[PDB]
């Protein structure tokens, strides 16, 4: 109950008060039963006092028994000192006041309720299993019980640390006790010498008895003196204890607890100093047993909160949910996207078929060694997430990881240990690498990443790093994305010789780098969104021989150079989204063209030389002002797909019958009214495959419509 | 609660104190209700006192009742001994002091809290099920609560054994009680003869009564004498008991318990000696019942925890669980991956069928000699685990262990006794054994082994330890995986004349070492991923007459030297993932070739001399630029597998039907349009053999498709 609160001084004062109550009860009983004064008249009186002046004979006073009783009563009422007459009652009153002052805060509803809440919460935290676990690995019920206790502690903290009504009240009680003690000793010491046995009396009742002065004798005086002295000593001890209590409560700020020891002893350095009222209760409970404060300490810490949260996530995210959370990616690779789960669950490491551990805004992951259990991990994909892997897991990752995708905002965010990786081949960086001159100090780790094969720089580099040019001896792909930042080639690509795919995306070259031509093993080149106006330099590509795909996804090219005719080995030109007015036959002198993307341009007509090409598979002239489609294009076979969108009023030739290899085709955005029946002649044409407006779909013969539908 | 704490002497003293309280109450009520002195004047007196000097007649004293009362009160207050008047109060005070000094430690907060903690711990551990189990199974949840109780015991030990407050308080308590008994006896024996019936009194109040000397009679004197004598006897008994307690607490030392009895009664020799306070509290419990102490020494034990915890691992990890873990490895051998288990389970030592024992991240493992049961074990794995081991286990390893795997994060993880092995033949060490600033001292132990023939190593070694060449006398299977670091042979390889199989994985030589040439015993050679450009040194390879597999892949080989034609006994040649552009006929003159691979190269033409390769059984041109297949390839009847996908091939000659031995051909990512029917001619061919797109499969006739589906 409240025994745990009571310090040693409170127990001592309580027992002293019980002893004083015993004294008061004994004195009251004595006064009630045997308190009387025996009085005898004095025959010879001088100066209002007794002069004291055969065998001896008695002195006859000639007084009745009642006359004696009456003089006794009168002398006792008027001459006996009040202290000797009401001593036990004063002691009882003082003891009752002391007891009321000591037990007032336990009955005042506000402080009593607050301390009841405090003691209940303290006991429920003390007897919890989580605290004993904390000072010293998975359980379910204790987790939610502990999290509930943690929450209750939080609520109590806000409800009590607000203001001091318990500290303030206790402070007062002590002051009142001290001042009472002072007064009791002062008045009692002053008036303790008036308790005398022999009491001289003069009451002027001559008319009733005949004697003026009497020599009374209070037989209870000596015992009252003994009781008064013993009570004085008890009050002295009580006052000394109260003085110590007052000194203890005014030597240090009890309103400010510390919780420093546990914070700097048993880890849990996240225990803050509690404010007023709560701090007073903690200091008060320290007197009984310091272990209680340590038990309460673990529930006021943040690291304990994250440990419990982990254990909860451990129970919460069971493998079955994670197995459901498992997905497959574009590359048919099993993916598990972790989307702000505070800390990564421990259960996923038990899973074995995972391949993607994409993490995103999950602070302080600190990859556990249990990752060695999982074997299918190749790609890891840190996204705005710190990481501090442990040594064995670091070694295992060094021996197993294949792909890494680092995304971040701040430069330091990039972990150091990633450079210790030795079996890395795919590396992608997202987030500004610019260190504002004297850069690349972080990036220098790529020197030891000699096994790297493909690298990505989405970081707005004004200049290409020297580190990447050094490491590019064995490298294959530079997927560089500047998001509008102008990149200076500075002939540095000339170092790269084993390189085979290059992509300067949104790098705003405005011109061909003129250094790419030095490379002799390039096969796929991509210049997307770089404001290319005139691109004649593409003639230099005739020097290259491994080239198979020229990509110009977005630019402002106006006139296509005729010198393309020299190019022969290219296959998959994608020059869509450009200000191309017309296409010359010079592109068509090439014969190895597999894929063509003459779409989203200002083309007006199609030369018959498209049909001259005999290796085309997929074509697209979408969003072009194509008034008429030449029938000669239909000579070309092996046309798996053929895009026609947002075109002009046209008329599809019946020669579509010679499209046996057609599988997909669009006829939208162009003014058409009669789709030829020979469309059904196509053997691999599906209802969904042919994308046309519904009405044009209706213009077909009904049986042909059925044939397309069943496909 | 406190009943167990109280020994017999405490109970006896408490009952004695109750009896003295009864004495005090009786004396107090008697002295309050019939304590009065009856006094009569002495008419004839000589030297004060009372001289003792027709029918008898009463003596007339001429005193009224009130004068008698006055003289009674006066001679009671003045001429009555204080002991006779205050004997019940003195005995009441003494009994209160004795009770307070007997129950002082039950109210002082520090000692009371420590005693309550000890009582709760003893009561909990006394009802613990594991006590019985230990005193002599583990159950489901009793085991974890038992663990908690063991852990709580540890916290209580660390909390209470640092001080000696309880022992000092009991010392002072007994000392003070003994002093009080001595003082009580000394003062009461001296002042007990003054309690008398006849009390002569002279008070000099003649001026009020007329008589000088009186003879009084205290009627309560005899009863008070009897009570005083009985109380003196009670105090004598109390003091004797207190002196016995003092002698018991002074004999031997109460701050040093032993627990030796149990350490011999039920093994558990681990139980140490408890210190101050903890020892005192236990001694008292022994004085109550030694059984309680014995049923708690179990938790104080350490092997008891190891037992409960190791058997708790049995709860987690039974023999049946190991049967589930039993898995065939790459060497179709039963293995067990103990993924940071708390410790090696005992049941694991009961699978004679086990032969591959993997220990992974299992801390502080101490291998027990029960390995004697395990005879089938031939090879074991040591990942991230330092293993302490016992001498019979060393012996068993000495005549039974065949191969050893070790991977270490740091040098100290490597056990020293591993070199004490003699029958060991394989050691595939992995870690950071480079030992910077430590040269290669750890490897020195290797010299001890003499039967080793496999020394796989991957620790980014800079140089080669000379102990390696020392063991090279019997070493024949040397594996070095420098993992991206450079190594020099430094003519050391010429020393190991018995070496017959060499590879430098990721050792980055950029040059064929000359040391290997002088050695004639080699048969398998790999220079995987060493950034090799020119390989003309293969001319010296003609001096070799046992080489049958030159595998050179993941390199930048461009030109194949003519000296290839010189060597003849080559059987397997892996040149894939290189920069080869032309295929010289010098490899074609060779007839012994059976396994050939030129995948991931810059090859567009296959010479017809492929026909003169009848020994070929598997060929790979995967991911290349060849678009015409030489028909002479089909002359190699022994050929049974082709890897020719991801090419620009567009025609399969019908002669493919002549390959009866053929089993598997993949053609995905190839420019084929009409897949020939002669493929169905192959008898061993199966649907799984044809890894080809479903469209080309449908290009097959329905009977051919049916045959493939049948397989």
**What is the rounded distance in angstroms from the CA atom of residue A95 to the CA atom of residue A62?**
47
Which residues, 6+ apart, have CB-to-CB distance to B240 below 8 Å? none
How big is the CA angle at A694 (ends A690 and A700), to the nearest 5 degrees? 70
> b/e string for B65-102 if b means 16 or more Cβ within 10 A?
ebbbbbbbbbbbbebbeebbbbbbbbbbebbbebbebb
Q: Which of A16, A27, A392, A399 to mutate to test the interface with B (most CBs of B within 10 A)?
A: A392
How big is the CA angle at B136 (ends B133 and B140), to the nearest 5 degrees? 15
**Does residue A552 contact residue A530 with C-beta atoms inside 8 Å?**
no
Q: Which helix (H) or strand (E) holds A525?
A: strand A524-528
Given the DSSP bridges, would you call strands B572-574 and B549-551 parallel, antiparallel or unpaired? Answer: parallel
The residue among B391, B362, B256, B378 whose CA lies nearest residue B329 is B378
The residue count for chain A: 711
Nearest to B65 among A59, A65, A392 (CB): A65
Residues on chain B touching A521 (C-beta within 8 angstroms): 579, 602
Which residues, 6+ apart, have CB-to-CB distance to A356 below 8 Å? A329, A333, A334, A335, A336, A337, A379, A380, A381
**What is the rounded distance in angstroms from the CA atom of residue A689 to the CA atom of residue A707?**
13
**What is the rounded distance in angstroms from the CA atom of residue A64 to the CA atom of residue B64?**
9
> b/e string for B471-489 if b means 16 or more Cβ within 10 A?
bbeebbbbbbbbbbbebee
Taking residue B44's Cβ as centre, other Cβ atoms within 10 Å add up to 12
Q: First vs last Cα of chain B: how many Å apart?
A: 83
C-alpha distance from residue A203 to each of A59, A78, A217, A355, B232 (Å) = 22, 7, 15, 114, 49
**What is the rounded distance in angstroms from the CA atom of residue A522 to the CA atom of residue A569?**
12
How big is the CA angle at B311 (ends B308 and B314), to the nearest 5 degrees? 150
Nearest to A38 among B63, B73, B109 (CB): B73
Residues on chain B touching A373 (C-beta within 8 angstroms): 339
**What is the rounded distance in angstroms from the CA atom of residue A95 to the CA atom of residue A101?**
10
**What is the rounded distance in angstroms from the CA atom of residue A183 to the CA atom of residue A180?**
5
**What is the rounded distance in angstroms from the CA atom of residue B60 to the CA atom of residue A93?**
50
C-alpha distance from residue A411 to each of A57, A93, A386, A443, B271 (Å) = 123, 77, 11, 10, 56
Q: Which of B35, B73, B647 to mutate to test the interface with A (most CBs of A within 10 A)?
A: B73
Q: Half-sphere exposure of residue B267, counting CA atoms within 13 Å on the CB side?
A: 7
Tokens found for residue A54: 């055969």
**Does residue A577 contact residue A553 with C-beta atoms inside 8 Å?**
yes
**Does residue A246 contact residue A106 with C-beta atoms inside 8 Å?**
no
Burial class (CB in 10 A: 0-12, 13-18, 19+), B15: exposed
Given an 8 Å threshold on Cβ–Cβ distance, is B208 in contact with A42? yes
Nearest to A38 among B69, B151, B207 (CB): B69
3-class secondary structure, B145 = helix
**What is the rounded distance in angstroms from the CA atom of residue B668 to the CA atom of residue B644?**
9
Residues on chain B touching A68 (C-beta within 8 angstroms): 64-66
Q: Half-sphere exposure of residue A373, counting CA atoms within 13 Å on the CB side?
A: 17
**What is the rounded distance in angstroms from the CA atom of residue A520 to the CA atom of residue A52?**
147
Residues on chain B touching A57 (C-beta within 8 angstroms): 62, 210
**What is the strand order of the sheet A359-360 is part of?**
A338-339, A359-360, A382-383, A403-407, A426-430, A454-458, A477-481, A501-505, A524-528, A549-551
The residue among B415, B437, B487 whose CA lies nearest residue B457 is B487
Given an 8 Å threshold on Cβ–Cβ distance, is B340 in contact with A217? no
Q: What is the CA radius of gyration of chain A?
A: 52
Compute the count of residue pairs across chains A and B with CB atoms less than 8 Å apart. 130
Instruction: Please tell me what DSSP assigns to residue B678.
Output: G
DSSP string, A378-436: -B--EES------HHHHHHHHHH--EEEEE-SSSTTS-SGGGG--S--EEEEES----S
Which residues, 6+ apart, have CB-to-CB distance to A172 below 8 Å? none
The residue among A648, A640, A594 whose CA lies nearest residue A621 is A648
Q: State the sign of the Cα–Cα–Cα–Cα dihedral B220, B225, B227, B231.
A: positive
Q: Which helix (H) or strand (E) holds B264?
A: helix B260-265
Given an 8 Å threshold on Cβ–Cβ distance, is A289 in contact with B673? no
Given the DSSP bridges, would you call strands A198-202 and A213-217 parallel, antiparallel or unpaired? Answer: antiparallel
Beta strands in A14-151 (DSSP E): 38-41, 45-46, 49-50
Instruction: Please tell me what DSSP assigns to residue A595.
Output: B
Q: Which helix (H) or strand (E) holds A338?
A: strand A338-339
Residues on chain A touching B64 (C-beta within 8 angstroms): 60-61, 63, 68
Question: Please, which experimental method was used?
Answer: cryo-EM
**What is the rounded distance in angstroms from the CA atom of residue B413 to the CA atom of residue B294?**
41
DSSP string, A221-283: HHHHHHHHHHHHHHHHHHHHHHHHHHHHTTTS-TTS---HHHHHSSS-TT-PPP-TTHHHHHH
Taking residue A73's Cβ as centre, other Cβ atoms within 10 Å add up to 13
Residues on chain B touching A7 (C-beta within 8 angstroms): 109
Phi, psi of B550 (to 5 degrees): -100, 105
C-alpha distance from residue A177 to each of A14, B232, B464 (Å) = 13, 41, 87
**What is the rounded distance in angstroms from the CA atom of residue A181 to the CA atom of residue A188?**
10
Q: Which helix (H) or strand (E) holds A454?
A: strand A454-458
Q: Which helix (H) or strand (E) holds B335?
A: strand B334-339
C-alpha distance from residue B687 to each of A60, A239, B683 (Å) = 151, 104, 12
**What is the rounded distance in angstroms from the CA atom of residue A208 to the CA atom of residue B65?**
20
Given the DSSP bridges, would you call strands B334-339 and B327-328 parallel, antiparallel or unpaired? Answer: antiparallel
Taking residue A401's Cβ as centre, other Cβ atoms within 10 Å add up to 21
Q: Tokens 């498709």 — which residue?
A: B705
The residue among B667, B557, B687, B572 whose CA lies nearest residue B618 is B572
Q: Which helix (H) or strand (E) holds A144?
A: helix A141-160
Residues on chain A touching B409 (C-beta within 8 angstroms): 391-392, 395
Could you tell me how far CA A533 lies from the centroid of its own chain?
Answer: 52
Could you tell me how far CA A300 lies from the centroid of its own chain?
Answer: 15
DSSP string, A158-223: HHHTT--SHHHHHHHHHHHHHHHHHHHHHHHHHTSTT--SEEEEE---HHHHS-SEEEEE-TTHHH
Instruction: Please tell me what DSSP assigns to residue A48.
Output: T
**What is the rounded distance in angstroms from the CA atom of residue B527 to the CA atom of residue B512?**
8
**Does residue A376 contact residue A398 with C-beta atoms inside 8 Å?**
no
Q: Which residue of B has its CA nearest to A227?
A: B89
Q: Which helix (H) or strand (E) holds A34?
A: helix A8-34
Residue B619: strand pairing partners? B596, B642
The residue count for chain B: 711
**What is the rounded distance in angstroms from the CA atom of residue A236 to the CA atom of residue B136?**
60
Q: Which of A44, A49, A57, A471 to mutate to test the interface with B (most CBs of B within 10 A)?
A: A57
C-alpha distance from residue A159 to each of A124, A165, A276, A284 (Å) = 17, 12, 11, 18
Q: Which residue of B has its CA nearest to A6?
A: B109
Given the DSSP bridges, would you call strands B403-407 and B426-430 parallel, antiparallel or unpaired? Answer: parallel
Phi-psi region of B669 (alpha: psi -120 to 50; beta: other; left: phi over 0): left
Q: First vs last Cα of chain A: how many Å apart?
A: 83
Which residues, 6+ apart, have CB-to-CB distance to B565 below 8 Å? B584, B585, B586, B587, B589, B590
3-class secondary structure, B639 = coil
Instruction: Please tell me what DSSP assigns to residue A108.
Output: S
Q: Which of B207, B340, B406 to mutate to test the interface with A (most CBs of A within 10 A)?
A: B207
Distance from CA of A56 to the nearest CA of B (A): 6
Which residues, 6+ apart, have CB-to-CB distance to A192 below 8 Å? A83, A225, A228, A229, A232
Which residues, 6+ apart, have CB-to-CB distance to B665 below 8 Å? B641, B642, B644, B656, B679, B689, B690, B691
**How large is the greatest C-alpha to C-alpha distance in chain A, in angstroms?**
180
**How large is the greatest C-alpha to C-alpha distance in chain B, in angstroms?**
181
Given the DSSP bridges, would you call strands B549-551 and B641-643 parallel, antiparallel or unpaired? Answer: unpaired
Residue A458: strand pairing partners? A430
Nearest to A132 among B74, B151, B212 (CB): B151
Q: State the sign of the Cα–Cα–Cα–Cα dihedral A622, A624, A626, A631.
A: negative
Residue A216: strand pairing partners? A39, A199
């Amino acid at each position: 109950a409240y025994r745990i609160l009571k310090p040693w001084w409170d127990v001592f004062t309580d027992y002293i008060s019980i002893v004083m109550l015993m004294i008061a009860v004994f004195g009251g009983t004595l006064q009630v039963t045997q308190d009387k004064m025996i009085c005898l008249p004095c025959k010879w009186v001088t100066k209002d006092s007794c002069n004291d002046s055969t065998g001896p004979t008695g002195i006859k006073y000639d007084l009745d028994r009642h006359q004696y009783n009456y003089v006794d009563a009168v002398c006792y009422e008027n001459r006996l000192h009040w202290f000797a007459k009401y001593f036990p009652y004063l002691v009882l009153l003082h003891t009752l006041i002391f007891l009321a002052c000591s037990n007032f805060w336990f009955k005042f509803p506000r402080t009593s309720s607050k301390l009841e809440h405090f003691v209940s919460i303290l006991l429920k935290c003390f007897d919890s299993p989580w605290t004993t676990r904390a000072l010293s690995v998975l359980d379910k019920k204790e987790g939610e019980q502990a999290k509930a206790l943690f929450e209750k502690v939080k609520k109590f903290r806000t409800h009590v640390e607000e203001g001091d009504i318990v500290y303030r009240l206790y402070m007062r009680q002590t002051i009142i006790k001290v001042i009472k003690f002072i007064l009791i000793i002062c008045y009692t010491v002053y008036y303790v010498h008036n308790i005398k046995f022999d009491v001289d009396c003069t009451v002027d009742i001559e008319s009733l008895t005949g004697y003026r002065t009497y020599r009374c004798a209070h037989p209870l005086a000596t015992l009252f003196k003994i009781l008064a002295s013993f009570y004085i000593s008890l009050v002295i001890f009580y006052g000394l204890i109260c003085m110590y209590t007052l000194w203890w409560m005014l030597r240090r700020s009890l309103k400010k607890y510390s919780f420093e020891s546990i914070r700097e002893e048993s880890s849990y350095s996240d225990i803050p100093d509690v404010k007023n009222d709560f701090a007073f209760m903690l200091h008060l409970i320290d007197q009984y047993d310091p272990l209680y404060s340590k038990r309460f300490a673990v529930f006021l810490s943040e690291v304990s909160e994250n440990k419990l949260r982990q254990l909860n996530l451990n129970n919460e995210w069971t493998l079955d949910k994670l197995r459901q959370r498992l997905t497959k990616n574009a590359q048919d690779k099993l993916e598990l996207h972790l989307f702000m789960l505070s800390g990564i669950p421990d259960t996923v490491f038990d899973l074995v078929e995972l391949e993607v551990l994409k993490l995103e805004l999950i602070p302080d992951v600190t990859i556990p060694p249990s990752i060695a259990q999982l074997t299918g991990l190749k790609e890891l994909w840190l996204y705005h997430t710190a990481a501090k892997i442990e040594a064995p897991a670091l070694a295992f990752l060094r021996e197993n990881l294949r792909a890494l995708h680092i995304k971040f905002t701040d430069i330091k965010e990039i972990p150091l240990w990633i450079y210790s990786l030795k079996t890395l081949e795919e590396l992608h960086l997202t987030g500004n690498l610019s260190a504002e001159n004297n850069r690349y100090i972080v990036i220098d780790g790529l020197r030891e990443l000699k096994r790297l094969k493909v690298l990505r720089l989405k970081s707005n580099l004004s200049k290409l790093p020297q580190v990447v040019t050094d490491v590019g001896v064995h490298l294959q792909k530079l997927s560089i994305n500047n998001e509008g930042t102008k990149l200076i080639v500075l002939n540095s690509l000339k170092k790269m010789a084993n390189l085979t795919e290059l992509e300067l995306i949104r790098c705003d070259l405005e011109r061909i780098p003129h250094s790419i031509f030095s490379l002799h093993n390039l096969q796929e080149i991509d210049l997307k969104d770089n404001n290319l106006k005139t691109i004649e330099e593409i003639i230099s590509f005739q020097h290259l021989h491994r080239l198979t795909c020229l990509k110009l996804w977005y630019n402002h090219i106006a006139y296509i150079p005729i010198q393309i005719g020299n190019l022969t080995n290219l296959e998959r030109l994608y020059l869509n989204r450009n200000k191309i007015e017309k296409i010359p036959t010079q592109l068509f002198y090439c014969r190895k063209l597999r894929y063509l993307d003459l779409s989203h341009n200002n083309l007006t007509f199609l030369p018959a030389d498209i049909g001259l090409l005999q290796n085309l598979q997929n074509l697209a002239i979408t969003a072009n002002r194509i008034e008429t489609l030449p029938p000669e294009l239909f000579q070309c076979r092996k046309l798996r797909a053929l895009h026609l969108g947002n075109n002009v009023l046209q008329s599809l030739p019946s020669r579509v019958g010679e499209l046996t290899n057609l599988t997909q085709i669009e006829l939208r955005g162009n003014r058409l009214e009669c789709l030829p029946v020979e469309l059904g002649e196509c053997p691999l044409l599906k209802r969904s495959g042919l994308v046309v407006e519904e009405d044009l779909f209706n213009t077909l013969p009904p049986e042909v419509k059925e044939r397309l539908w069943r496909a």
